[PDB]
Design a protein around this ligand. Structure first.
Ligand SMILES: Nc1ncnc2c1ncn2[C@@H]1O[C@H](COP(=O)(O)OP(=O)(O)O)[C@@H](O)[C@H]1O
Lengths: 534, 185
RNA sequence: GUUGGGCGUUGCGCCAAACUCUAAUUUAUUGAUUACAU
């Protein structure tokens, strides 16, 4: 029948195994427009194969193009695909927040067309135009299993004819693919899209938990619902409190019908044994009614055992996985339960029971962040062996908030260990977060330009990463004792090695910094060496 | 539970399903969250009370029963329920005994309906016939108002009447105006 | 990380070599080109 050569190429690609090759194969055989006669069965097969081949893929942002945005004239960046963490480092006023704000307004559009039918989203406002210019444009390429989706969002001031029209060719494709996969199979894993703005500082409060049991019931439990108010920052805790109540209620409401069923089985076993009843039934064994009743009792007991086995294999790990993944991230804390008097949660630390609303400010932001990620991954990913292994983009902005410089060396690797399939484009200003990621991933930003990190930014001396990535001196740049240190060091390595000021600065810098440190022992040893030489 | 904290504010009266669903939800969850020892007793009361109505054994009992052994057996499993309900009564507890009585109110005012559970993933407070049905969605509009009224009466009588193995056996006045309100013929 | 050579348990495995401006090719029933049937 002379199948077209392009059709044969697509069939060969599908045989090799691709998700788009079969997408454009069940839409080529389901309509007369594409040029081939519509065959329904052999299009349904391609649709099923396309949906089946989507599993195991990670959705990542590949590149980005800013033009006349907030502070960048022309920016081109490429995010690594073999690495799952990108870090933006720069001064306050260079534009690391601008790139995250540009990744959103496109992630909002992707979420809107992946969840809702609105086909709307964010856009470039008039106040975000570069001062003096007229046109702006943001382009983002989305990746999935090595196959890329284009995007571009642009605007023009309403005084000149628009020179950049919006286009969303690839994100409609991606949304349609995911929706079809959901249609054929209700439990297909979907990517997670969310950003956490600095406004998560005041996330947890008593006001939010007070009325968390007064919200709509259908707003938390469905796959397509873990997308509302998810890119607005402010990691939600009220909805998390409602969700935690419902899961703990499922545990406290079931597992008692299981106990009741076990008690019923024991009572039925006693009723069947029942020496008096057995002796009475032994009087007339050949009676048809007695045999019927005994056989029906045995069948009912077997059915009750089957009913017990039905709930014997529930294992509602929806709570256990979240609790275990959230306990590890916050050291020491364990045994998080609920207390119903002022409808508040209780968590135990160092064998001390405390409410979440009264915890340290540096431990509730992280708590809510991890809880929101875990809940959204569980909602988006249906029943599976591990529901925290999903994909998507998580944008943690200003990670250095409310963190002692002891957890900054264990925040990125712990997020990557617990969540090992999520991209984590983040921005930071603490130089104890940088020295845990490869140098090729950190993207320095200054003066509206992208600079690669120097060689060897992984585990090293914090002074060296500070000096070579922030242009900030290890010692104070303007301090009286630092100036005395310099005025001692230069005179040691020059004239006046033992003179008017050598001894007095030596004593002054020995009173402070201690008489036994690194620099001063070096200087004293070398002055002894080169006074002995003379 | 001092018999006077709910006796008041009853001269006006309220009977709606919106405030009954939230009430029954807490009553079935708070009773099961803590305690958890009365739950097994109440469930086994349900089992023993519903297993007696077995048509096969009922017909055998109604058949020739000249031997006193069957009479002794029936008296024995009646005394089983007697002592079981006596034990539940001995467990003096508000929010744990009113559930059993309010369930019995709907087990009798709606003839032939079996155990009543409360699912959570969908709320769907289900009533068990030989086929499963749902109360929050189905059961008309007035068949919820009247059930709410019956539930309120049962709860108030149970609270007003400590002990009283059959708490819904008090005595008093209950005035209803336009009893024909939201009823199918 | 990318490019050209070689062998053949060849819709590609291995071997032997190289290069780093901050930075990888996809459209037919169309038009241009190579080639067979004319
Ligand atoms: N209309 C504009 N004209 C000139 N500069 C702008 C304009 N809008 C935004 N900017 C620049 O955007 C910068 C804001 O930095 P920001 O995106 O918040 O990154 P960060 O938070 O890491 O400092 C500012 O330096 C500002 O100069």
């Amino acid at each position: 029948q002379n199948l077209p050569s392009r059709i044969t190429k697509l069939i060969k690609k599908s045989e090799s195994g691709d998700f788009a090759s079969s997408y454009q194969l069940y839409k080529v055989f389901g309509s007369k427009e594409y040029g081939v006669e519509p065959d329904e069965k052999m299009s349904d097969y391609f649709k099923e194969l396309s949906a089946k081949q989507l599993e195991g893929g990670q959705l990542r942002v590949a590149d980005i193009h800013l033009e006349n945005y907030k502070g960048f004239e022309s920016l081109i960046m490429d995010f690594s695909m073999k690495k799952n963490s990108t870090i933006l480092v720069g001064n306050n006023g260079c534009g690391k927040s601008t790139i995250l704000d540009a990744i959103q307004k496109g992630l909002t559009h992707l979420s809107s067309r992946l969840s809702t039918r609105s086909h709307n989203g964010d856009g470039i406002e008039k106040h975000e135009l570069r001062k003096g210019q007229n046109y702006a444009s943001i382009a983002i390429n989305y990746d999935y299993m090595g196959i890329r989706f284009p995007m571009i969002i642009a605007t023009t001031e309403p005084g000149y004819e628009d020179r950049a029209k919006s286009n969303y060719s690839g994100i409609n494709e991606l949304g349609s693919i995911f929706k079809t996969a959901h249609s054929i199979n209700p439990n297909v894993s979907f990517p997670l899209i969310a950003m956490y703005t600095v406004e998560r500082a005041n996330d947890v409060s008593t006001r939010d938990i007070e009325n968390s049991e007064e919200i709509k019931e259908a707003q938390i439990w469905d796959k397509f619902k873990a997308y509302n108010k998810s890119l607005t920052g402010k990691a939600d805790f009220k909805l998390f409190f409602r969700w935690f109540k419902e899961l703990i209620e499922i545990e406290n409401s079931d597992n008692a019908d299981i106990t009741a069923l076990r008690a019923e089985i024991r009572a039925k076993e006693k009723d069947l044994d029942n020496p008096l009843l057995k002796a009475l039934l032994a009087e007339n064994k050949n009676s048809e009614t007695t045999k019927k009743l005994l056989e029906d009792h045995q069948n009912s007991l077997k059915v009750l055992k089957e009913k017990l086995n039905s709930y014997y294999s529930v294992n509602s790990k929806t709570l256990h996985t979240v609790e275990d993944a959230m306990y590890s991230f916050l050291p020491g804390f364990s045994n998080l339960k609920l207390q119903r008097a002022p409808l508040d949660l209780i968590v135990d630390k160092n064998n001390v029971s405390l409410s979440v609303l009264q915890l340290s400010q540096g431990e509730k932001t992280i708590l809510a962040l991890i809880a929101d990620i875990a809940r959204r991954l569980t909602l988006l990913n249906p029943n599976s062996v591990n529901p925290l292994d999903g994909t998507g983009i998580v944008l943690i902005d200003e990670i250095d908030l409310h963190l002692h410089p002891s957890w900054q060396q264990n925040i990125i690797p712990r997020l990557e260990k617990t969540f090992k399939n999520i991209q984590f484009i983040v921005t930071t200003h603490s130089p104890q977060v940088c020295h845990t990621i490869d140098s090729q991933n950190i993207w320095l930003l200054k003066n509206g330009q992208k600079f690669k990190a120097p060689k060897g930014v992984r585990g090293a001396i914090s002074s060296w990463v500070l000096e070579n990535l922030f242009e900030v001196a290890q010692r104070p740049p303007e301090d009286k004792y630092t100036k005395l240190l310099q005025e001692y060091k230069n005179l040691v390595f020059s004239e006046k090695y033992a003179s008017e000021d050598a001894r007095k600065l030596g004593a002054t810098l020995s009173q402070h910094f201690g008489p036994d440190d690194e620099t001063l022992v070096e200087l004293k040893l070398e002055i002894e060496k080169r006074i002995w030489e003379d």
